[PDB]
Design a protein around this motif. Structure first.
Motif, PDB file in Angstrom:
ATOM      1  N   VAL A 156       0.809  -1.223   0.000  1.00 53.36           N
ATOM      2  CA  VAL A 156       0.000   0.000   0.000  1.00 53.36           C
ATOM      3  C   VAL A 156       0.842   1.273   0.000  1.00 53.36           C
ATOM      4  O   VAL A 156       0.314   2.368  -0.218  1.00 53.36           O
ATOM      5  CB  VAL A 156      -0.957   0.025   1.226  1.00 53.36           C
ATOM      6  N   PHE A 157       2.153   1.151   0.241  1.00 56.82           N
ATOM      7  CA  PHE A 157       2.976   2.351   0.393  1.00 56.82           C
ATOM      8  C   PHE A 157       2.947   3.214  -0.866  1.00 56.82           C
ATOM      9  O   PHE A 157       2.949   4.453  -0.782  1.00 56.82           O
ATOM     10  CB  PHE A 157       4.420   1.979   0.729  1.00 56.82           C
ATOM     11  N   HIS A 158       2.932   2.577  -2.043  1.00 55.92           N
ATOM     12  CA  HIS A 158       2.970   3.335  -3.292  1.00 55.92           C
ATOM     13  C   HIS A 158       1.696   4.146  -3.502  1.00 55.92           C
ATOM     14  O   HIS A 158       1.748   5.244  -4.073  1.00 55.92           O
ATOM     15  CB  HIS A 158       3.179   2.400  -4.477  1.00 55.92           C
ATOM     16  N   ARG A 159       0.541   3.614  -3.078  1.00 51.63           N
ATOM     17  CA  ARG A 159      -0.702   4.360  -3.233  1.00 51.63           C
ATOM     18  C   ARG A 159      -0.632   5.679  -2.481  1.00 51.63           C
ATOM     19  O   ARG A 159      -1.197   6.682  -2.925  1.00 51.63           O
ATOM     20  CB  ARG A 159      -1.891   3.533  -2.740  1.00 51.63           C
ATOM     21  N   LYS A 160       0.079   5.699  -1.355  1.00 51.34           N
ATOM     22  CA  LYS A 160       0.157   6.900  -0.541  1.00 51.34           C
ATOM     23  C   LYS A 160       1.004   7.988  -1.179  1.00 51.34           C
ATOM     24  O   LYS A 160       0.785   9.172  -0.886  1.00 51.34           O
ATOM     25  CB  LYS A 160       0.725   6.556   0.838  1.00 51.34           C
ATOM     26  N   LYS A 161       1.947   7.625  -2.064  1.00 51.11           N
ATOM     27  CA  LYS A 161       3.032   8.534  -2.417  1.00 51.11           C
ATOM     28  C   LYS A 161       3.210   8.731  -3.925  1.00 51.11           C
ATOM     29  O   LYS A 161       4.282   9.178  -4.359  1.00 51.11           O
ATOM     30  CB  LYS A 161       4.342   8.026  -1.795  1.00 51.11           C
ATOM     31  N   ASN A 162       2.198   8.445  -4.738  1.00 50.37           N
ATOM     32  CA  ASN A 162       2.331   8.549  -6.204  1.00 50.37           C
ATOM     33  C   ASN A 162       3.482   7.699  -6.730  1.00 50.37           C
ATOM     34  O   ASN A 162       4.245   8.116  -7.609  1.00 50.37           O
ATOM     35  CB  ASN A 162       2.509  10.008  -6.639  1.00 50.37           C
ATOM     36  N   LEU A 163       3.617   6.497  -6.183  1.00 48.55           N
ATOM     37  CA  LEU A 163       4.581   5.526  -6.663  1.00 48.55           C
ATOM     38  C   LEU A 163       3.853   4.440  -7.441  1.00 48.55           C
ATOM     39  O   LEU A 163       2.714   4.093  -7.136  1.00 48.55           O
ATOM     40  CB  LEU A 163       5.350   4.889  -5.513  1.00 48.55           C
ATOM     41  N   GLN A 164       4.520   3.914  -8.453  1.00 48.19           N
ATOM     42  CA  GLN A 164       4.017   2.758  -9.168  1.00 48.19           C
ATOM     43  C   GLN A 164       4.632   1.519  -8.536  1.00 48.19           C
ATOM     44  O   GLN A 164       5.763   1.559  -8.080  1.00 48.19           O
ATOM     45  CB  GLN A 164       4.370   2.859 -10.656  1.00 48.19           C
ATOM     46  N   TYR A 165       3.872   0.427  -8.497  1.00 48.69           N
ATOM     47  CA  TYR A 165       4.345  -0.830  -7.899  1.00 48.69           C
ATOM     48  C   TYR A 165       4.383  -1.928  -8.973  1.00 48.69           C
ATOM     49  O   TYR A 165       3.423  -2.074  -9.767  1.00 48.69           O
ATOM     50  CB  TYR A 165       3.394  -1.295  -6.721  1.00 48.69           C
ATOM     51  N   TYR A 166       5.435  -2.765  -8.937  1.00 44.39           N
ATOM     52  CA  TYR A 166       5.426  -4.009  -9.691  1.00 44.39           C
ATOM     53  C   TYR A 166       5.993  -5.152  -8.857  1.00 44.39           C
ATOM     54  O   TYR A 166       6.989  -4.970  -8.145  1.00 44.39           O
ATOM     55  CB  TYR A 166       6.282  -3.966 -10.992  1.00 44.39           C
ATOM     56  N   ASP A 167       5.375  -6.332  -9.003  1.00 48.38           N
ATOM     57  CA  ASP A 167       6.007  -7.581  -8.643  1.00 48.38           C
ATOM     58  C   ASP A 167       7.139  -7.857  -9.643  1.00 48.38           C
ATOM     59  O   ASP A 167       6.940  -7.727 -10.859  1.00 48.38           O
ATOM     60  CB  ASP A 167       5.058  -8.758  -8.759  1.00 48.38           C
ATOM     61  N   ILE A 168       8.266  -8.314  -9.154  1.00 50.18           N
ATOM     62  CA  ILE A 168       9.363  -8.723 -10.036  1.00 50.18           C
ATOM     63  C   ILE A 168      10.005  -9.999  -9.490  1.00 50.18           C
ATOM     64  O   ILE A 168       9.880 -10.346  -8.319  1.00 50.18           O
ATOM     65  CB  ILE A 168      10.438  -7.640 -10.241  1.00 50.18           C
ATOM     66  N   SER A 169      10.664 -10.734 -10.377  1.00 47.86           N
ATOM     67  CA  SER A 169      11.537 -11.831  -9.976  1.00 47.86           C
ATOM     68  C   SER A 169      12.817 -11.650 -10.780  1.00 47.86           C
ATOM     69  O   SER A 169      12.876 -11.953 -11.983  1.00 47.86           O
ATOM     70  CB  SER A 169      10.920 -13.191 -10.209  1.00 47.86           C
ATOM     71  N   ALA A 170      13.870 -11.145 -10.135  1.00 43.87           N
ATOM     72  CA  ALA A 170      15.125 -10.946 -10.846  1.00 43.87           C
ATOM     73  C   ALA A 170      15.635 -12.256 -11.465  1.00 43.87           C
ATOM     74  O   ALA A 170      16.129 -12.265 -12.611  1.00 43.87           O
ATOM     75  CB  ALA A 170      16.188 -10.374  -9.882  1.00 43.87           C
ATOM     76  N   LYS A 171      15.552 -13.365 -10.721  1.00 48.58           N
ATOM     77  CA  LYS A 171      16.185 -14.597 -11.182  1.00 48.58           C
ATOM     78  C   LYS A 171      15.491 -15.184 -12.404  1.00 48.58           C
ATOM     79  O   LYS A 171      16.108 -15.964 -13.124  1.00 48.58           O
ATOM     80  CB  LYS A 171      16.232 -15.617 -10.053  1.00 48.58           C
TER      81      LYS A 171
END
Ligand SMILES: Nc1nc2c(ncn2[C@@H]2O[C@H](COP(=O)(O)OP(=O)(O)O)[C@@H](O)[C@H]2O)c(=O)[nH]1
Ligand SMILES: [Mg+2]
Ligand SMILES: [Zn+2]
Lengths: 34, 206
Positions: B135-150
């Motif tokens: 939820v942190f991104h909703r508060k701060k105009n951030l975009q969120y993505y799930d990622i898997s580097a490997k």
């Protein structure tokens, strides 16, 4: 869209930061322009 | 020294130690073969080119040498950053709890630069930080993505979003994926579908 080549400082060879020509020193890593 | 015009951006990649920052930036093969070590700051700068419909753009990604395990990063690390990725590990709740601290440190030096929040290691089945909790991104105009580097899962997404914001072109596209190190683990397709659904639900639910 318009190509950045039409649409569009010196670059530090140590950290790649783009610096303003007034600076003879990279403001990030302190590498001299010379 | 002065290097010998091209769109390029300084991107700082921050987040707790062990979250996968180095593994992530290293997926981009040319960015790794052309990386620069900055001795004064203990940083490896990876030049990551992406080919857009309007030409090439380079994210010069600043990867630490582990110093984040022992305290905050020094001002020179952050200085003149134009964008950022904050990473956490979805199997470690504490790394997500520390996201606001990284964000505060970033904004203190760089103000309102575009930032993407990335939850890494989604290939691991026993996931602790789930979409409903993120939820942190909703508060701060951030975009969120799930990622898997490997597994390279969603590798391009943070960069595409940042590119659109920095250029001011919501229709910008990548014409091809960068050449990436081959996946070291499988991102289970069904798991990916579930996680994408869970994020969709969190975003549309009333
Ligand atoms: N299963 C899995 N392990 C990862 C992934 N990314 C990093 N790891 C591992 O997490 C450990 C820390 O990765 P590292 O890139 O050094 O994180 P950093 O300290 O944030 O730079 C290492 O053992 C990585 O192999 C991922 O996407 N999936
Ligand atoms: Mg690292
Ligand atoms: Zn420099």
């Amino acid at each position: 869209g318009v190509e950045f080549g039409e649409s569009l400082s010196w670059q530090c060879d140590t950290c790649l930061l783009q610096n303003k020509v007034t600076d003879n020193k990279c403001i990030a890593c302190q590498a001299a322009k010379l | 020294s002065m290097a010998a015009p091209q769109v390029q951006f300084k991107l700082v990649l921050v987040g707790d130690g062990g979250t996968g920052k180095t593994t992530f930036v290293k997926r981009h093969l040319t960015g790794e073969s052309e990386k620069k070590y900055v001795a004064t700051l203990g940083v490896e700068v990876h030049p990551l080119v992406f080919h857009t419909n309007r030409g090439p753009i380079k994210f010069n990604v600043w990867d630490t040498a582990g110093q984040e395990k022992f305290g905050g990063l020094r001002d020179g690390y952050y200085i003149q950053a134009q964008c950022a990725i904050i990473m956490f590990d979805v199997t470690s709740r504490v790394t997500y709890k520390n996201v606001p601290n990284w964000h505060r440190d970033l904004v203190r030096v760089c103000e309102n630069i575009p930032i993407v929040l990335c939850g890494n290691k989604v290939d691991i089945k026993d996931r602790k930080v789930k979409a409903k909790s993120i939820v942190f991104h909703r508060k701060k105009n951030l975009q969120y993505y799930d990622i898997s580097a490997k597994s390279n899962y969603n590798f391009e997404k943070p960069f595409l979003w940042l590119a659109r914001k920095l250029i001011g072109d919501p229709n910008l596209e990548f014409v091809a994926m960068p050449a990436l190190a081959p996946p070291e683990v499988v991102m289970d397709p069904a798991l990916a579908a579930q996680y994408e659904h869970d994020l969709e639900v969190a975003q549309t639910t009333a």
